[PDB]
Curated annotation (Swiss-Prot):
Changing R320Q: In AH5; selectively ablates 17,20-lyase activity, while preserving most 17alpha-hydroxylase activity. The keyword Lipid metabolism applies. Phosphorylation is necessary for 17,20-lyase, but not for 17-alpha-hydroxylase activity. This is Steroid 17-alpha-hydroxylase/17,20 lyase. PROSITE patterns: CYTOCHROME_P450 (PS00086). It comes from Homo sapiens (Human).
Length: 466
């Protein structure tokens, strides 16, 4: 009896479980590096820190490309910007000038710590109004970080109640929802197989994004002066002015680079904040030790600062642990081989897609003690006095040419937001008793389901107000 002709084979079902965990579970059968082919495309998935550090860092330049996808073309205005732009002159110039802009907040009256705390102060005033009520804190945080990144990009902020904030939220959500059905890695290209309206819907939200930032740019060409460079749009048009490189710095190149910075600065930081609160609702013991730590190292005399990370070490460890258990990009952003090369002595051809399964690195049982569990302690020494790097299999912000350029801002935003909130607010399960689901929702970012938290002004903070 004969065996059937096989014209197709996939190791696991499409749309069943998170794909970063489906690739991870496949390592027990096929090892830490394997490939999948779909038509002409071959994709390599890497799930061990050694091979990952080879792709990102040792041969970083060889694998610094980004694959072309119809959906990412639209959000990037055909691969301009930074994150979805391929390797080459465009990407390298704008990333540098984007990273050069962050240097401008070293110290002064426009210090990054001072810009963060200015918006956090308004945030906590708005949250204090909800004393005794259960709310979704997504939007208040969204406003806070949106103003920070808009200050870094334009030296402008939005006043309370500005409708543009709700317009931005609407398109942010619309773009994320249509950029990918689940994570960016789609095994099967469903979008070109059946009639859908995903590209059309995505174009609609991106047009609103582009139109909104185009108007801002135009208005700013009258305000720009070469003698004053204080934000990222100043930095980039300074470059355009100076090259008089020119093709690289058109208005749509400048707009798209801002769009990447605007989008990343809001959606990542807002997301990690919600994740941390969700974990603290699930672990009151860890939550209480954070209250005890901050009362003993900062008290209520003053508000937190960036220097307090030297003594708020359980807080810094808690943030580290969320970025491990629930990485913002559990499979980073897809990489591509820019030239013929090798991974683990295995051949990888030019143009091949390469994906680092950061989820596999952060949940490897040989590199981590009980990787399923939430344990900020793992990042602290046994006496709780010094922070440690317990594992070399940890790259929350990537590494190499494609590493994250907003890491510094992110770690400051995350540390200061949770410090100010823990100082001032009790953060408890709502009256219904529902705890947030920690399963997550994989999109281009690893999001959490909306949830509510009962927020109360702490008594110890009040009593210090006399
Ligand atoms: C917890 C906060 C954040 C995390 C965990 C995070 C993590 C990452 C990771 C893992 C990557 C990709 C690495 C790779 O593709 O190989 C990335 C890319 C990037 N991140 Fe972040 N990020 C965060 C916040 C931010 C912020 C606030 C910005 C502000 C601009 C930012 C800007 C970027 C950009 C521009 C890229 C693309 C880099 C490139 O393609 O060259 N990120 N992020
Ligand atoms: C999709 C996105 C959000 C919605 C929006 O309205 C505008 C866009 C375009 C720019 C996108 C952004 C989301 C995050 C992106 C993908 C990314 C990233 C990913 C994970 C950690 N840090 C950074 C770099 C560029 C960013």
């Amino acid at each position: 009896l004969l065996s059937l002709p096989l014209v197709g084979s996939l190791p696991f079902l499409p749309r069943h479980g998170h794909m970063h965990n489906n690739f991870f579970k496949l390592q027990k059968k096929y090892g830490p590096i394997y490939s999948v082919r779909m038509g002409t495309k071959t994709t390599v998935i890497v799930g061990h820190h050694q091979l990952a550090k080879e792709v990102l860092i040792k041969k970083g330049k060889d694998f610094s490309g980004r694959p072309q996808m119809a959906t990412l073309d639209i959000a990037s205005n055909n691969r301009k910007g930074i994150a979805f732009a391929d390797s080459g002159a465009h990407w390298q110039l704008h990333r540098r000038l984007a990273m050069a802009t962050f240097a401008l907040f070293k110290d002064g009256d426009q210090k990054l710590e001072k810009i963060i705390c200015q918006e956090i102060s308004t945030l906590c005033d708005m949250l204090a109004t909800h004393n005794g009520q259960s709310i979704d804190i997504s939007f208040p945080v969204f406003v806070a970080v949106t103003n920070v990144i808009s200050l870094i990009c334009f030296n402008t902020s939005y006043k309370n109640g500005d409708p543009e904030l709700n317009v931005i939220q609407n398109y942010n959500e619309g773009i994320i929802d249509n950029l990918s059905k689940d994570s960016l890695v789609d095994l099967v290209p469903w979008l070109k197989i059946f009639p859908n309206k995903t590209l059309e819907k995505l174009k609609s939200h991106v047009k609103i994004r582009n139109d909104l930032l185009n108007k801002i740019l135009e208005n700013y060409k009258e305000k720009f002066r070469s003698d004053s460079i204080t934000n990222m749009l100043d930095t980039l048009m300074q470059a355009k002015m100076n090259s008089d490189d020119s093709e690289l710095l058109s208005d749509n190149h400048i707009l798209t680079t801002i769009g990447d910075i605007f989008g990343a600065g809001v959606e990542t930081t807002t997301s990690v904040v919600k994740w941390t609160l969700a974990f603290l609702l699930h672990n009151p013991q860890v939550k209480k030790k954070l209250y005890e730590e901050i009362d003993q190292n900062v008290g209520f005399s003053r508000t937190p600062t960036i220097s307090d990370r030297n003594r708020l070490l359980l807080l810094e460890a808690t943030i580290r642990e969320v970025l491990r258990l629930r990485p913002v990009a559990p499979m980073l952003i897809p990489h591509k081989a820019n030239v013929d090369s090798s991974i683990g002595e295995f051949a990888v051809d030019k143009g091949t897609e390469v994906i680092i399964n950061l989820w596999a690195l952060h949940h490897n049982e040989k590199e981590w003690h009980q990787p399923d569990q939430f344990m900020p302690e793992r990042f602290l020494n046994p006496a709780g006095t010094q922070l440690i790097s317990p594992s070399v299999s940890y790259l929350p912000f990537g590494a190499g040419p494609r590493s994250c350029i907003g890491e510094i801002l992110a770690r400051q935003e995350l540390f200061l937001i949770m410090a100010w909130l823990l100082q001032r607010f009790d953060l408890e399960v709502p009256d219904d008793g529902q705890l947030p689901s920690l399963e997550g929702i994989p999109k281009v970012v690893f999001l959490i389901d909306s949830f509510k938290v009962k927020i109360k002004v702490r008594q110890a903070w009040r009593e210090a107000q006399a």
